[PDB]
A paper describes a structure:
We now introduce the ALFA-tag, which addresses these clear objectives. Its 15 amino acid sequence is hydrophilic, uncharged at physiological pH and devoid of residues targeted by amine-reactive fixatives or cross-linkers. As a counterpart binding the ALFA-tag, we additionally introduce a high-affinity nanobody (NbALFA), which proves to be suitable for super-resolution imaging and intracellular detection of ALFA-tagged proteins and allows very efficient and clean immunoprecipitations and Western blots.
To better understand the interaction between NbALFA and the ALFA-tag, we solved the crystal structure of NbALFA in complex with the ALFA peptide. The paratope accepting the ALFA peptide extends from the nanobody’s N-terminal cap to the side formed by the five-stranded β-sheet. As a result, the ALFA peptide is oriented parallel to the central axis of NbALFA. The ALFA peptide forms an α-helical cylinder with a length of ~2 nm and a diameter of ~1.3 nm, that is stabilized by a complex network of intramolecular interactions. First, the peptide binds to NbALFA in an α-helical conformation and has an unusually high propensity to form a stable α-helix also in solution. As a result, no energy needs to be spent in forming the required structure during binding, which would otherwise disfavor complex formation. Second, the peptide forms multiple specific contacts with the nanobody along the whole length of the 13 amino acid ALFA core sequence (SRLEEELRRRLTE). The resulting resin efficiently and strongly bound an ALFA-tagged GFP variant (shGFP231): Even after 1 h competition with an excess of free ALFA peptide at 25 °C, most of the target protein remained on the resin (red solid line). In line with these observations, SPR assays indicated that the affinity of NbALFA to an ALFA-tagged target was ~26 pM.
Residue numbers in the entry:
A (entry chain B): 1 to 15
B (entry chain A): 4 to 124
Write the structure that this text describes.
């Protein structure tokens, strides 16, 4: 995954 | 980056709704290097990200909406859309168009206006 995609994964799992 | 949502409003449980969003004040080449996506917020919750298309064209989803929500990005026309199928009462929220910029040391959030989606029998 890219830098943005690693940051997107974090945001999409934040409750 | 200026973002504007179209669509919203009332749907019955199990129903479908499409939101769209256009970006302006940004070139195609600049916006290509950014992510585009969608957040939602119900009263008494924080804004949380539900779907995005990365700068590499990869759609990504929150588990609670995967399969039901489809996010699509038109790079050429600087648009992102959220097709919401099989909607549930707990999908009721204000939905925000969002762009994520990598500013190297930090990330920058660009926000749309928000549009209410209401799921009611």
């Amino acid at each position: 995954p890219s830098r943005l995609e690693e940051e997107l994964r974090r945001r999409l799992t934040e409750p | 980056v200026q973002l504007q949502e179209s669509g919203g409003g009332l749907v019955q449980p199990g129903g479908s709704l499409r939101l769209s969003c256009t970006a302006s004040g940004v070139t195609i080449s600049a916006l290509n290097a950014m992510a585009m996506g969608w957040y939602r917020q119900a009263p008494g919750e924080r804004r949380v990200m539900v779907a995005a298309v990365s700068e590499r064209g990869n759609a990504m989803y929150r588990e609670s909406v995967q399969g039901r929500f489809t996010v699509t990005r038109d790079f050429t026309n600087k648009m992102v859309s959220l097709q919401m199928d099989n909607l549930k009462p707990e999908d009721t929220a204000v939905y925000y168009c969002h762009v994520l910029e990598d500013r190297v040391d930090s990330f920058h959030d660009y926000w749309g206006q928000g549009t209410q989606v209401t799921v009611s029998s």
